[PDB]
């Protein structure tokens, strides 16, 4: 209201203490065009905003295996005071590291840690985005059969699967959803053989929810589509990022086209940048569980190459999820 006792201070003597933020990444890698890449793009954007460069204020530790999680988190604790575990698999390793270094701040993305003051947890309503992808798929199938390729069987991927199945059923319960898990988020070759089998059995759309494994699903669809006419093409649904650019191909008939129907979005990069800024300002949300959903645009659907009829079904289904009229199952 008033500040009568005051002293003039030079801007040269006032300074804001910066933080150093690192992500510890799973097998998928920061080049997975999806989940880990979104996180890494977010951290790079944050680095650029704070005048930093890789291994000088921000970095990523790629995990070779589960045994490398603890090694990478301990290496990170040498130089970084905000450490993100990217993926549900880092749950136990982040719990242990947070108990050893109570002075550092940790974030688990895609899972919850309870009762740890220096750990924040982030989850996404991927069931809600999955539902929208299902409505999209149900409005474009000609064969009335669609594929789902998961990475590792988990509460997280079951959220996508349940939402996707529910969204397909909301339009046409006649449609068959073939489900297959790769057992990995970093196995393109297994993604390719699963997609090959799903397409050969008469799926005309595959939704890939397996991070970097999904590069194989894109490779299979591209090979089938290059050896066919444009109007007989087979679709993939993108995940985490808008993957439209990965769908570029040329048909047997010489026509330039795109086989990405739609992508589910998961704003992991946005979350990494926002929490990094809060940690640097001394407002780290330790002990809290942050839930992103359709409402706050933490998840969404990019409607890329969907028919106008499909976009209407998606916009209508989105309204019903926001209003509460449709409750999307999580399992
Ligand atoms: N634990 C883990 N989950 C991943 C990874 N890549 C992708 N995912 C999950 O799979 C979904 C589809 O890529 C993402 O939204 C994440 O939930 C990874 O490397 N590790
Ligand atoms: Ni005042
Ligand atoms: Ni004074
Ligand atoms: Ni800074």
DSSP string computed for 193-238: HHHHHHHHTT-SEEEEESGGGHHHHHHHHHHHHHTS-GGG--EEEE
Task: For ligand 1, atom 12, name the residue with the nearest CA.
Answer: 209
Q: Is the CB of 133 under 6 A from ligand 1?
A: no
Cα–Cα separations (whole angstroms), residue 323 to 65, 96, 188: 43, 40, 39
Pairing mode of beta strands 105-109, 82-86: parallel
| Entry resolution (Å) | 2.3
4 alpha carbon – ligand 2 mean position (Å) = 10
The helix (H) or strand (E) run that includes residue 169 is helix 155-169
Pairing mode of beta strands 248-250, 176-181: unpaired
Q: Is the CB of 111 under 6 A from ligand 1?
A: no
**Nearest 10 degrees: Cα torsion 271, 273, 278, 280:** 150
Pairing mode of beta strands 248-250, 256-258: antiparallel
CA dist 154 and 152 (Å) reads 6
Which of 305, 303, 285 lies closest to 107, judged by CA?
285
Q: Are 130 and 163 in contact (CB under 8 A)?
A: yes
Q: Is the CB of 40 under 6 A from ligand 1?
A: no
Phi, psi of 119 (to 5 degrees): -125, 125
User: Is 278 flagged in the annotation as binding?
Assistant: no
Return the CATH superfamily for domain 126-266+296-323: Response regulator (3.40.50.2300)
**Largest Cα–Cα distance of the chain, in whole Å?**
81
Give the tokens for residue 31. Answer: 């080049």
Q: Are 272 and 19 in contact (CB under 8 A)?
A: no
Residue with tokens 């921000």: 58
CA dist 171 and 137 (Å) reads 10
Q: Is the CB of 187 under 6 A from ligand 1?
A: no
CA dist 258 and 166 (Å) reads 26
Residue to probe by mutation, ligand 1, list 42, 85, 87, 187, most atoms within 8 Å of CB? 87
DSSP states along 50-98: TT-EETBEEEEEE-SSTHHHHHHHHHHHTT-SEEEEESGGGHHHHHHHH
Phi, psi of 150 (to 5 degrees): -90, 160
Task: For ligand 1, atom 6, name the residue with the nearest CA.
Answer: 211
CA dist 80 and 97 (Å) reads 13
Q: Is the CB of 159 under 6 A from ligand 1?
A: no
Query: In the chain, after which residues is the C-to-N distance over 2.5 Å, breaking the chain?
Result: none
Residue to probe by mutation, ligand 1, list 156, 181, 183, 242, most atoms within 8 Å of CB? 156
Number of the ligand 1 atom closest to the C-alpha atom of 212: 6
Say how far residue 241 (Cα) sits from the centre of its chain. 7
Q: Is the CB of 298 under 6 A from ligand 1?
A: no
**Structure determined via:** X-ray
Query: Is residue 106 classed exposed, middle or buried when 0-12, 13-18 and 19+ CB atoms within 10 A define those classes?
Result: buried
CA dist 277 and 284 (Å) reads 9
CA dist 159 and 131 (Å) reads 10
Residue to probe by mutation, ligand 1, list 23, 28, 237, most atoms within 8 Å of CB? 28
Q: Is the CB of 89 under 6 A from ligand 1?
A: yes
286 alpha carbon – ligand 2 mean position (Å) = 30
User: Is 282 flagged in the annotation as binding?
Assistant: no
Number of the ligand 1 atom closest to the C-alpha atom of 214: 13
Q: Return the sign of the alpha-carbon dihedral for residues 271, 205, 223, 179.
A: positive
CA dist 7 and 175 (Å) reads 73
Task: For ligand 1, atom 11, name the residue with the nearest CA.
Answer: 209
CA dist 232 and 241 (Å) reads 26
CA dist 30 and 148 (Å) reads 23
Number of the ligand 1 atom closest to the C-alpha atom of 240: 15
Which of 78, 90, 75 lies closest to 39, judged by CA?
90
Q: Is the CB of 29 under 6 A from ligand 1?
A: no
Pairing mode of beta strands 57-62, 21-25: parallel
Task: For ligand 1, atom 14, name the residue with the nearest CA.
Answer: 35
User: Is 240 flagged in the annotation as binding?
Assistant: yes
CA dist 26 and 36 (Å) reads 8
Q: List, in order, residues 6 or more apart from 76 with CB less than 8 Å away.
A: 22, 24, 61, 83
**8-state DSSP, 46:** H
Q: Is the CB of 161 under 6 A from ligand 1?
A: no
Residue with tokens 């199938």: 141
């Amino acid at each position: 209201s008033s500040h009568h006792h005051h002293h003039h201070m030079s801007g040269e003597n006032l300074y804001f203490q910066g933080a150093s933020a690192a992500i510890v990444t799973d097998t998928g890698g920061v080049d997975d065009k999806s989940f880990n890449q979104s996180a890494w793009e977010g951290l790079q954007a944050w680095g650029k905003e704070h005048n930093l460069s890789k291994d000088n204020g921000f970095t990523y530790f790629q995990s070779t295996s589960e045994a490398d999680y603890a090694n990478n988190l301990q290496q990170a604790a040498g130089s970084y005071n905000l450490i993100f575990g990217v993926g549900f698999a880092l749950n136990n390793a982040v719990k242990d590291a947070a108990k050893e270094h109570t002075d550092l701040n940790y974030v688990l993305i895609d899972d919850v840690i309870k009762d740890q003051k220096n750990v924040a947890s982030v989850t996404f309503a991927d069931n809600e985005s999955g539902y929208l992808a299902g409505v999209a798929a149900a409005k474009t199938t000609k064969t009335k059969q669609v594929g789902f390729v998961g990475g590792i069987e988990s509460e997280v991927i079951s959220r996508f699967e349940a939402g996707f199945k529910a969204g397909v059923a909301s339009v046409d319960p006649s449609i068959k959803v073939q489900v297959d898990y790769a057992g990995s988020f970093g196995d393109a070759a297994k993604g390719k053989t699963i997609a090959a089998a799903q397409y050969a059995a008469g799926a005309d759309i595959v939704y890939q929810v397996a991070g970097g494994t999904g590069a194989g699903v894109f490779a299979e669809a591209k090979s089938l589509n290059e050896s066919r006419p444009e109007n007989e093409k087979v679709w993939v649904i993108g995940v985490d990022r808008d993957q439209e650019a990965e769908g570029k191909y040329t048909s047997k008939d010489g026509k330039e086209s795109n086989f990405v129907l739609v992508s589910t979005l998961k704003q992991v990069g946005t979350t990494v940048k926002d929490i990094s800024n809060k940690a640097e300002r001394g407002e780290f949300p330790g002990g809290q569980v942050i839930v992103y959903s359709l409402k706050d645009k933490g998840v969404d659907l990019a409607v890329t190459n969907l028919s106008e009829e499909g976009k209407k079904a998606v916009e209508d289904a989105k309204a019903k999820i926001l209003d509460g009229s449709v409750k999307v199952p999580e399992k």
